[PDB]
Amino acid sequence: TATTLNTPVVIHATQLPQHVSTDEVLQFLESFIDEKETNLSSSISQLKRIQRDF
Amino acid sequence: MYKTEKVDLALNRNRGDPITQHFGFGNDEWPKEWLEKLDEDGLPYIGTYVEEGDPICAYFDDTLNKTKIKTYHSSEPAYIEEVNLIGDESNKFQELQTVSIKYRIRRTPQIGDKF
Amino acid sequence: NLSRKLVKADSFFMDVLVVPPTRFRLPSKLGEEVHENSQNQLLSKVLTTSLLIRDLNDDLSKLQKDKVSLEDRRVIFSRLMNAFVTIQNDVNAFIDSTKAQGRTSGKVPIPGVKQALEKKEGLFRKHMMGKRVNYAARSVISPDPNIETNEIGVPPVFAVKLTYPEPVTAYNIAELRQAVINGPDKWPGATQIQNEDGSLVSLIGMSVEQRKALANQLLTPSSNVSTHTLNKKVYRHIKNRDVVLMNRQPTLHKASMMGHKVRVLPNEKTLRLHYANTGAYNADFDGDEMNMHF
Amino acid sequence: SAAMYSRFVKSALDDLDKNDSTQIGIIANQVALPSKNPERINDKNLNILLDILSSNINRIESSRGTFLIQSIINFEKWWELPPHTLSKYIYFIKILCSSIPKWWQDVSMILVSCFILPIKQTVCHHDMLKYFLRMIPSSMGFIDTYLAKFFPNKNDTRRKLVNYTSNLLKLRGYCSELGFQIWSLLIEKIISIDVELQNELGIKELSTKLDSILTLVSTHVEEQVTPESLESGEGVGVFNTLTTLFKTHVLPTYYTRSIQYIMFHVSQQQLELMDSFLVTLIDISFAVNEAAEKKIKSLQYLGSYIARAKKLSRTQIIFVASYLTSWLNRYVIEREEEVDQRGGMERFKHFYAAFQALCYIFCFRHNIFRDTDGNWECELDKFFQRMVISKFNPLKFCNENVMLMFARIAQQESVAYCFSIIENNNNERTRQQFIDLQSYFPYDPLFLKNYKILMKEYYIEWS
Amino acid sequence: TTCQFLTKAVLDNEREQLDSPSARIVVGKLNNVGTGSFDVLAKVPN
Amino acid sequence: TFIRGPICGTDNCPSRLWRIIDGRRTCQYGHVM
Amino acid sequence: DRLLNSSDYTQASVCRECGSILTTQQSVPRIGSISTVCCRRCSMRFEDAKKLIFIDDSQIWEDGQGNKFVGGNETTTVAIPFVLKYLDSELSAMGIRLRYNVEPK
Amino acid sequence: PEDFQQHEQIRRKTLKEKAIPKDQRATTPYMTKYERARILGTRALQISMNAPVFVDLEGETDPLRIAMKELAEKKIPLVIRRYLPDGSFEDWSVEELIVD
Amino acid sequence: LKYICAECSSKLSLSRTDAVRCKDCGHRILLKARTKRLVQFEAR
Amino acid sequence: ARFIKKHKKQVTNPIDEKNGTSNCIVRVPIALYVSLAPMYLENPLQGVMKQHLNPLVMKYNNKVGGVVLGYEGLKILDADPLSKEDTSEKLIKITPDTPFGFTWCHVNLYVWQPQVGDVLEGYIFIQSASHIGLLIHDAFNASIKKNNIPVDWTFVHGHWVDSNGEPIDGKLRFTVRNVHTTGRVVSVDGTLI
Amino acid sequence: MDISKPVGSEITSVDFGILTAKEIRNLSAKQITNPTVLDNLGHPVSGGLYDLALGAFLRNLCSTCGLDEKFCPGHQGHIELPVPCYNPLFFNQLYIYL
RNA sequence: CGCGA
DNA sequence: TTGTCTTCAACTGCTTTCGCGATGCATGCATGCATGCATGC
Ligand SMILES: [Mg+2]
Ligand SMILES: [Zn+2]
Ligand SMILES: [Zn+2]
Ligand SMILES: [Zn+2]
């Protein structure tokens, strides 16, 4: 299941979160998915549909 | 070395709780290799070689309706030296509830033996 | 005090009692004769005395002060003034037998929590400052001059039992295969196999062939993602490459516990040393035993 | 009856609306009965109930309506129901899962659990899945775990396995997104069974068990593998993900010759497959940092691949194998000087592996080698006779059979001269492991049957 | 004497910072004898 | 070595638990848990 | 290492908030939900949240009796000798809390 | 998050205080008898777990021999952090630290 | 004849639910006689 | 008196323009403390991703309170404070007991965080008798409850029917009621009232 | 003990404190009001010392943790005392400060 | 409080 | 008257390392010989 191997020990937001423009999202999803090319495979499949939205 | 082991299956009883168990096989299924070590009455044959886990006795249980077994605990292989059928006082009517067993154990001058 | 939590006298009151989880309170079987945990008994007495005053004080409370005779006080209102000592004392027994009243001036007190920790061990120096361990073997030393001083003679018995699993890599797979194939019965052997998930597979009840399976099957990926970082571990029999840690009790000084390269000696059941070690271990080879740690 | 049952369950819902939930449980009791118990809810009542529950599902949602939902989902053999009941059931599952895609998980769990069945009983399952997966994409992750968490044990009967595996193939097309861990789960168990057999030569069982699945797979493979799949199809990436799993999972296994024929089988379906699979083997063999034993076995797989294979442009074979000889020539230069240096000949083991590779290459010589002029490609006669008597003395260090194999037909074909130097090997004649390394050729006549004939086109009878 | 110390120990709300081996011993950490004085830190490209 | 009980904690059995004194408990294919 | 492994080594959940080994326990999860560890001391009765703004979905967790608990979800795994647990069990009986300061915070 | 962003800034400052600069590094240039051990030990574990290995194995099936074999070449990629009692530490690259 | 009186040595056999004692003497302790059976030993 | 409400989201999804919805996608800089397998000691960034980040991708998280869309700016924090942030070599404290290194890493997460009252749109895959299903951004599965649907609307055989009488289709504006992360998957509860 | 299960968090220091009843009630998985131990069937008497709310017992699964005997860590319960009782270890401190 | 340095 | 060091004297803690290893008193079944009660012819 979840162990220290696959899971962070502890996580903290360092700052208040920052909303983003779709372009950034586009830039990200572009760059992000681009940079990604195995559980990666199944999820980016969603992302493609998610950017396909935009 | 002779270790004499006493096997009593009547200890649990409460001197009246009626006899639960009987030295011997039951009509139920049992591995049937027990025949090699154990005699037809559930006791082991005199002089039979023994190693750990081997059947030292066969006692059928009425409650569990099982043929259960005592096994040889010691890791050092022993022999069946003597088997003693011990009846009890209080005017018979009491079947065999207890047996004592001598084990014979070969001792040679192994390395490590103090002289 | 950073929390700035105030001090409250409730400390010393010792109101409610924390019940150790069942597993520490489990019964005690002497032979086949079984006995409830002694601490449970000391708990029970409080539980008994608890409902007592609970129910007893309940009745006097139900008793109407006009209906109550001023004597009806002295039979009850004075009666609680007794059991209060017991319930306060049962607490003591439950903790400190020394603070507990004598029971029949004899029969010995049942050990309280305080007594479990303290006397002569009671715990800290029994199960903490020292412990019983694993991958350790005690046996009788025998002088062997032919091994090297740093070495140690190991009977095949211990060679078969002791096992130090080695992280399945590359360089080792050439051995560990054969180490598995050999068997727990054949030294150098192997006993279990830790898969990446942490599961163990014993090789004991296995014949050679479907065992050769695991050996070949051994080094291979595993679909499970959380395990991609890991490799199978095998529990090889100890072998000449290994080092053990020898101990002869009592241990007067660190030199009385030394490491030793392992040489596996066939044919005999005794640990065996070179002589140079004797002066250190202070061992006369008269029925001497030494603890091997692996 | 019908009107009674309707008002009965409608009142029951208000009991849960009023938190009583007793009738809810009692209803949930009935529906939770096994398929065998005649007291199981009848179809018509369930028909009434499903639509009522499909009317307002949000009336149900709670900790209380929960147990009802379980019995609903845990109702056995729902796929065996009359279609209208089955439809309303399906139509119901769609609603709740779309309302709260929480239950879909164990719904899917059941769906996964059914993969052990043949295709027919599982169609609605696959039909159920291939919808929600695309609709509930996050399902893809944990359903795969259910593909994992539920697989039949080796020791388990084939009936589950071969039907389970087939059901995976069935779903495999429905979701190409996963597309991978399927094979991963497959190949492992596939391997896990493979290794069981080799050391055996229950035997008859796994023999049948494995053979059922391999022929099941290779068929599904050769089905999905077609030139039209080599272009707009996914067989390319599939061929990729197969090579990777071969590379990652299959290559490291030891003395395992049962499923490495799979790639041998498929890569013979198309010569691009042959090509794209061939370039990999060469890249694997000569990679720098890889283990020499991996290199050796790389030339054992690639080596014993070619000349037992059928569909391959022969000319493709020779050049890099002749570059191998060039590779061997660049090899001999820097090294014979090290031969006389301090060390043994096993230092050179990668060569003898490449030489064990070439004496297997010698198998093709007998069939077709003597060009139109009869001359041996790249001057083989003079090439080896020098390399043969070289400080390598490669005749001595390679396999007992294929060297003797290379011995006969070579001089018969007038390739080179051996038996003279072979006798020079025996008179002058890590150590044993090294012997075991080359001796195994991970291709060989199969001990199986139906798939064996599937490879008859693909196999070259040595006779 | 455990409690008498343990008592005083609690009475001060004493924080124990796990230095002495016996302390560390109890907790189950490493010790400060020697093979546990210096920390091993890896390195890495970037 | 049998006790039948406790099936097997490995979902490719369930194959059939005997306990050894060392508490591994062992199922026939050869999980020790 | 020898001592630890030959005397009891496991690993255990500790509340990085309530700083205790014992108060931790598994969660009894829902279908569609995995179980998880939560600390009893730092967990509250779900009734209290709606008393006084909305409550996070995950913070709720249910015991063996299904009682919704909010909070107490801060836990790690720390490697200790097992007897340490038993030791705390005893000191807990005496009413003595052992707060374990854990890094990373 | 600001409270977390706080003691992260606090984490640096103290851990800035506790670091000793290279020039400022006052301790022995030698590798202590202990440092040698744990290095070999730690490096051995990693080598056992398929960490990258800089030197050829040449038939070493023993990770600890391997660790020894790197140490001869100072190819070991570690750093010892020597704690003064105050808690301020130093950092010694392996290779920069004189063996035996 | 599986058994022997622990006293008079009289050979005897028994049955299920039988008085355990010497049918002659009555000594309630009984010995199990050794019978022809194949047991292996190495002369080493 | 006592504040346990110190855990709350003080960031609110602002209603966007030009549109009527709000952006629930957000960039949060975070700090995580993770482990590094011994094999990745030459690819520490590469490892952490495969070892930790990649699993988080497109799953809900409690800390950020959303589903992780992805990550940017992965920065391993060198143990040595003295080393300039330019240094190609960084230090990772090895576990005393085990070879696994543990470290802090800074990274920026893009996370879609629906709050309550947020305005969103989504296509309708199924119009049920009970509800209306919604894929949000063709990923997040949302549902609108019957009671939440204004009663004046109807469902036929089938498909829903609004107040104006037409069935409704495709992208649908709605107001968030709840977000259900308890199940393995996110479930967005919207409402039209 | 296996190196393949790294333990991330570590114990820096230990603090000594006293359990306050308010805590003790919140952190108690069960109350034990019943001196009774086992029924005739051997099942743990609810409200008794062996109540399965304190953990699993025999084959009986844990009430609280729900896990079997192997994986249930055990859970500690409380006994409400009708009377405030002098904490014997302290007492002297009580005695002195009083 | 018996057995072994 | 009252301050306090003065003195003797009531409580109270530990001890070189490991393996091999409950009493009494009431209830009732047990035994044996002699009247009664139930089956059969
Ligand atoms: Mg002596
Ligand atoms: Zn199993
Ligand atoms: Zn807590
Ligand atoms: Zn007689």
Count of CB pairs separated by less than 8 Å, C with F? 23
In angstroms, what is the span from residue C290 Cα to ligand 1's centroid? 11
Residues J41 and J68 in one domain: yes
The correct CATH number of C135-161+239-294 out of 2.40.40.20, 3.40.50.300, 3.40.1280.10, 3.40.1360.10 is 2.40.40.20
Closest nucleotide (C1' vs CA) to C284 is L5
The correct CATH number of B1-108 out of 3.50.50.60, 2.40.50.150, 3.40.50.300, 3.90.480.10 is 2.40.50.150
Closest nucleotide (C1' vs CA) to E1 is M13
In angstroms, what is the span from residue D115 Cα to ligand 2's centroid? 21
Q: Which residues pair with K31 in a beta bridge?
A: K78
**Which chains would you list as touching G if contact means 3+ CB atom pairs under 8 Å?**
A, C, D, E, J, K
Which residues form the domain of J65? 1-117
Q: Give, in Å, how far the C1' of L1 lies from the CA of B107.
A: 30
Closest CA to C268 of J165, G77, B111, D455: B111
What is the DSSP track for H67-87? Answer: HHHHHHHT---EEEEPBPTTS
- Is the Cβ of K7 closer than 8 Å to some Cβ of chain J? yes
* Cβ atoms of K9 and G95 closer than 8 Å: no
Mutate to test the interface with B, among I10, I11, I15, I32 (most CBs of B within 10 A): I32
Of J30, J37, J59, the CB nearest to A13: J30
The domain segmentation of chain B, as residue ranges, is: 1-108
Cα separation, C271 vs C155, whole angstroms: 6
- J89 contacts E44? CB cut-off 8 A: yes
Is C124 (CB) below 7 Å from strand M? Answer: no
* Cβ atoms of A54 and A25 closer than 8 Å: yes
Is C127 (CB) below 7 Å from strand M? Answer: no
Omega of the bond prior to A36 within 30 degrees of 0, cis?
no
- Starting from the CA of residue C282, give the closest ligand: 1
Which residues in chain A touch residue K9, judged by CB atoms under 8 angstroms apart? 9-10
Cα separation, D409 vs D402, whole angstroms: 11
Q: What are phi and psi for residue H14, nearest 5 degrees?
A: -60, -50
Q: Which domains does chain G have, with CATH numbers?
A: 1-104 (3.90.1800.10)
Domain count, chain H: 1
Residue keyed to tokens 């109890």: E26
Which residues form the domain of H88? 1-100
Residue keyed to tokens 């050999």: C182
- H91 contacts J80? CB cut-off 8 A: yes
Closest CA to K6 of B17, G11, D148: G11
Domain count, chain J: 2
- Is the Cβ of B96 closer than 8 Å to some Cβ of chain I? yes
Cα separation, B102 vs C9, whole angstroms: 68
**Those residues with Cβ within 8 angstroms of residue D292's Cβ, 6 or more apart along the chain or in another chain:** D349, D350, D353
Closest CA to C77 of C89, C68, C87: C68
- Is the Cβ of G31 closer than 8 Å to some Cβ of chain D? yes
Of A3, A5, A9, the CB nearest to K9: A9
Cα separation, G66 vs K63, whole angstroms: 10
DSSP label at residue K59: T
From D142, which residue of chain J is nearest by alpha-carbon distance? Answer: J184
Closest CA to D443 of D459, D463, D420: D459
Query: How do C257-264 and C151-154 pair as beta strands?
Result: parallel
Sign of CA dihedral K51, K56, K62, K65: positive
State the distance between the two ends of chain F, measured CA to CA, in whole angstroms.
16
Cα separation, C130 vs C134, whole angstroms: 13
Question: Within chain F, where are the H helices?
Answer: none
Cα separation, J58 vs D2, whole angstroms: 47
Mutate to test the interface with D, among G28, G30, G31 (most CBs of D within 10 A): G31
Closest CA to D136 of D171, D110, D105: D105
Cα distance from C45 to chain B (closest Cα, Å)?
29
- Tell me, what CATH number does H14's domain have? 3.90.940.10
Q: What are phi and psi for residue G50, nearest 5 degrees?
A: -60, -15
Cα separation, A42 vs F8, whole angstroms: 32
- Is the Cβ of C293 closer than 8 Å to some Cβ of chain E? no
Closest CA to D296 of D356, D346, D384, D343: D356
For residue G15, give the 3-state DSSP assignment. Answer: strand
Cα separation, F18 vs F1, whole angstroms: 6
What is the DSSP track for chain A? Answer: ---TTTS-SEEEE-S--EE--HHHHHHHHHHHHHHT--HHHHHHHHHHHHHHH-
For residue C175, give the 3-state DSSP assignment. Answer: helix
Interchain contact H/F (3 or more Cβ pairs less than 8 Å): no
Q: How was this structure determined?
A: cryo-EM
* Cβ atoms of K74 and C22 closer than 8 Å: yes
- A9 contacts K5? CB cut-off 8 A: no
> What is the separation of C-alpha C208 from the centre of its chain, rounded to a whole number of angstroms?
35
- Is the Cβ of E33 closer than 8 Å to some Cβ of chain J? no
Is C131 (CB) below 7 Å from strand M? Answer: no
Which residues in chain K touch residue C114, judged by CB atoms under 8 angstroms apart? 89
Fold of I1-44: Rubrerythrin, domain 2 (2.20.28)
* Cβ atoms of J146 and J135 closer than 8 Å: no
Pick left, alpha or beta for residue B45 (phi over 0 → left; psi -120 to 50 → alpha; otherwise beta): beta
* Cβ atoms of D178 and D144 closer than 8 Å: yes
Residues J130 and J111 in one domain: no
**Those residues with Cβ within 8 angstroms of residue E18's Cβ, 6 or more apart along the chain or in another chain:** E24, E27, E29, K11, K12, K13, K14
Final resolution, Å: 3.4
The domain segmentation of chain D, as residue ranges, is: 1-463
Cα separation, J132 vs J172, whole angstroms: 10
**Looking at the domain covering C162-238, what would its CATH class be?**
alpha beta
Strands (E), G22-95: 24-26, 37-39, 43-45, 60-62, 68-71, 75-78
Q: What are phi and psi for residue F12, nearest 5 degrees?
A: -125, 10
- Starting from the CA of residue C202, give the closest ligand: 2
Cα separation, B88 vs F20, whole angstroms: 37
For residue G77, give the 3-state DSSP assignment. Answer: strand
Element (H, E) at G82: helix G82-93
From H75, which residue of chain E is nearest by alpha-carbon distance? Answer: E43
CB-contacted nucleotides of strand L (7 Å)? 4-5
- J145 contacts D58? CB cut-off 8 A: yes
Cα separation, J130 vs J147, whole angstroms: 9
**Those residues with Cβ within 8 angstroms of residue H34's Cβ, 6 or more apart along the chain or in another chain:** E34, E35, E37, E38
**Which chains would you list as touching H if contact means 3+ CB atom pairs under 8 Å?**
A, C, E, J
Cα separation, D287 vs H56, whole angstroms: 16
- Is the Cβ of B94 closer than 8 Å to some Cβ of chain I? yes
Q: Is K72 annotated as a binding residue?
A: yes
Q: Is K43 annotated as a binding residue?
A: no
Count of CB pairs separated by less than 8 Å, E with K? 35
CA angle A25, A31, A35 (to 5 degrees): 140
In angstroms, what is the span from residue I29 Cα to ligand 4's centroid? 9
Sign of CA dihedral B44, B46, B49, B51: positive
